Amino acid sequence: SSVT
Amino acid sequence: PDVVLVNGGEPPNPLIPTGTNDSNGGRIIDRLFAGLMSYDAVGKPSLEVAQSIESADNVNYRITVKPGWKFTDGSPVTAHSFVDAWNYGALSTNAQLQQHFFSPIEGFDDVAGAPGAASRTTMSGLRVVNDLEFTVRLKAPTIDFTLRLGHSSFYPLPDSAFRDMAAFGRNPIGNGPYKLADGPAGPAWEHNVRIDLVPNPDYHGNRKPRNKGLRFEFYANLDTAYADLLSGNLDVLDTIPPSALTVYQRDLGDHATSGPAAINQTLDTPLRLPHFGGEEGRLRRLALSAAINRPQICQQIFAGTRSPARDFTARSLPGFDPNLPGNEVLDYDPQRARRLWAQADAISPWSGRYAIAYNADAGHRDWVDAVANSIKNVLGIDAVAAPQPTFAGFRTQITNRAIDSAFRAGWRGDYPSMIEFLAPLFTAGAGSNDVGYINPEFDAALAAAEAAPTLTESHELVNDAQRILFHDMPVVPLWDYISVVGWSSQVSNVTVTWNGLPDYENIVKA
């Protein structure tokens, strides 16, 4: 998943 | 409070598993559903909803579903609950960000963006046998197909979802260890503030909660979150702010733990931006990589809690190799950076501003400022930081292509497979390919790595495929993570998993  | 208070953020997208590509939504979705497999804290899968998953060839799979599972609306979990959710994810008409995970299934090309039968709405390779059994036929051997069956893209959905998926995404109904609260003063999901979850009494799987609920608090600022941790107003903080990196050990003692996690950070420059497409753009991306001093930033900005990238994946993954030929593109070399940038200027002279957008809610300010300053000083260009307040808004601009600058990105692993760090980001049609990179030779190299019969061969083929990435520099890999997680004196049994997240179900609160 795309972090942050 | 009796529930465990942990940090999170507003999901950029509704709470639909196949529509969730980010960690803010992901950390919620993974509490609400149970898939065919579940993952332990080291990322090893075990049978969960599946009674069996059988394949002798990595091409043909027979999946049997355990009887007696249900969603929190009382309806049963059946083979259809899986097959209908997977077909929904795969069909291009539904524009699901996780579509890519279905790509190895025969018939994907009919329903996705590919040559094939555009009237078809389901994948021919997915076949229901009976209420609790289905088969999967892949187009080619796929060494991480079994492993990925714990991932959210494969979660089952209740029949009611499909009648109104927008309504479902606002108020999801799942089958997993937690469910949304029916809280005493307003909705469980208070947008931009928090989400409240309580245990699902129906659930009897591998992740039974050891606590009475979870509250994900959507902090606007990680310094606020750290202050709350120190005062006991937050129980678990999975990201220590930069301001605290040199003091957390003094502040928290044995209530903080650190370790490598399968998470990376990149600098993404869409190929559609001025001066950043074609061969010109390739030369400029190589120049940017050479203009960034990853050891220095890791030491000074991050106090040693990031490790300089040596490839496009993460040091802690199986088969990782930090000494691949061609990885010198990830070494700081100002003279080389200027030579590459000048070669790009031979095609078209640079002009304008290079801006790095980021979400300010997650502690990126210091490093982004440092990288922009490094690029400015090495290359002599107008490079600046461009903060945005929230991850949700930032990702929305990236996804809809409104963003008009470079931007930070990075991947938190979904399961421990190097291919999983590459295919979702760099294959031509992937929903999380934020920059528009297309190289069919790379996609073919990954397919070859997937077809290998053994993990050792597969890993060596993945690493061969990464040579193409060293040449193309589709994004600039920066560093991978040393996670630092702190917790309050009111909780215990806090374990940090392989991808840096708390093992939420197992946290205990007296």
Residue B255 and residue B291 in one domain: no
Contact A2 B408 (CB under 8 A): no
Q: State the Cα torsion B177-B226-B182-B208 to the nearest 10°.
A: 10
For residue B92, the one-letter residue type is S
Residue B363 and residue B253 in one domain: no
- How many angstroms separate the CA atoms of B147 and B120, rounded? 28
Residue B82 and residue B200 in one domain: yes
Q: Which residues contact B493 (CB under 8 A, 6 or more apart)?
A: B210, B506, B507, B508
Residue B271 and residue B335 in one domain: yes
Angstrom CA distances, A1 to B256, B414, B425, stand at 24, 6, 10
Q: Which residues of B touch A4 (CB under 8 A)?
A: 23, 359, 362, 364, 391, 408, 410
Burial (CB count <10 Å: 0-12, 13-18, 19+), residue B492:
middle
Instruction: Give all strands (DSSP E) within B347-425, no chain letters.
Output: 353-359, 382-388, 406-409
Experimental method: X-ray
The total number of residues shown for chain A amounts to 4
- Residue B254: count of CB within 10 angstroms of its CB: 6
- How many angstroms separate the CA atoms of B404 and B414, rounded? 29
Displacement of CA B41 from its chain's centroid (Å): 16
Residue B42 and residue B165 in one domain: yes
- How many angstroms separate the CA atoms of B188 and B316, rounded? 36
Resolution in A: 1.3
Displacement of CA B509 from its chain's centroid (Å): 28
Phi, psi of B62 (to 5 degrees): -115, 125
Angstrom CA distances, B267 to B3, B92, B232, B345, stand at 37, 28, 35, 21
Asked if B409 reaches chain A (Cβ–Cβ under 8 Å), the answer is yes
Q: Which residues contact B66 (CB under 8 A, 6 or more apart)?
A: B49, B50, B51, B132
Contact A1 B263 (CB under 8 A): no
Q: Is B355 helix (H, G, I), strand (E, B) or coil?
A: strand
Q: Which tokens is B251 given?
A: 């502040």
- How many angstroms separate the CA atoms of B77 and B85, rounded? 12
Q: Is B102 helix (H, G, I), strand (E, B) or coil?
A: helix
- How many angstroms separate the CA atoms of B488 and B166, rounded? 37
- Residue B355: count of CB within 10 angstroms of its CB: 18
Phi, psi of B363 (to 5 degrees): 80, 25
Q: Which tokens is B103 given?
A: 């790509």
Q: Is B4 helix (H, G, I), strand (E, B) or coil?
A: strand
Q: Which tokens is B40 given?
A: 């332990």
Q: B87-125: buried (b, 16+ CB within 10 Å) or exposed (e) per residue?
A: bbbbbeebebbbbbbbbbbbbbbbbbeeeeeeeeebbbb
Chain B residues 252-311 within an 8 A CB cutoff of chain A = 263-265
Domain count, chain B: 2
Burial (CB count <10 Å: 0-12, 13-18, 19+), residue B435:
buried
Displacement of CA B383 from its chain's centroid (Å): 28
User: Closest approach of chain B CAs to the CA of A1, in angstroms?
Assistant: 5
Q: Which residues of A touch B359 (CB under 8 A)?
A: 4
Residue B395 and residue B272 in one domain: yes
Asked if B412 reaches chain A (Cβ–Cβ under 8 Å), the answer is yes
Residue B254 and residue B328 in one domain: no
Q: Is B267 helix (H, G, I), strand (E, B) or coil?
A: strand
Residue B72 and residue B4 in one domain: yes
Contact A2 B364 (CB under 8 A): no
Residue closest to B19 by CA, chosen among B152, B113, B112, B148: B152
Q: Which tokens is B424 given?
A: 């979702």
Residue B340 and residue B230 in one domain: no
Contact A2 B409 (CB under 8 A): yes
Angstrom CA distances, B202 to B46, B234, B277, stand at 20, 28, 53
Contact B395 A2 (CB under 8 A): yes
Structural domain of residue B307, as residue ranges? 260-482
The total number of residues shown for chain B amounts to 510
Residue B264 and residue B342 in one domain: yes
Contact A3 B411 (CB under 8 A): yes
Residue B294 and residue B306 in one domain: yes
For tokens 């998953």, the residue is B53
Chain A residues 1-4 within an 8 A CB cutoff of chain B = 1-4
Residue closest to B36 by CA, chosen among B150, B158, B135: B150
**CA atoms within a 13 Å half-sphere pointing along the CA-CB vector of B4:** 30
Q: Which residues of A touch B39 (CB under 8 A)?
A: none
DSSP state of B66: P
Beta-bridge partner residues of B76:
B70
| B391: nearest CA partner in chain A | A4
For residue B299, the one-letter residue type is Q
Residue B310 and residue B169 in one domain: no
- How many angstroms separate the CA atoms of B172 and B294, rounded? 41
Beta-bridge partner residues of B60:
B137
- Which ranges in B253-363 belong to alpha helices (H)? 278-290, 294-300, 334-347
> Is the torsion defined by CA of B394, B395, B397, B403 positive or negative?
positive
Q: Which residues of B touch A1 (CB under 8 A)?
A: 20-23, 26, 411-412, 414
Q: Which residues of A touch B395 (CB under 8 A)?
A: 2
Q: Which residues of A touch B416 (CB under 8 A)?
A: none
DSSP state of B506: G
- Residue B31: count of CB within 10 angstroms of its CB: 23
Q: Which residues of A touch B155 (CB under 8 A)?
A: none
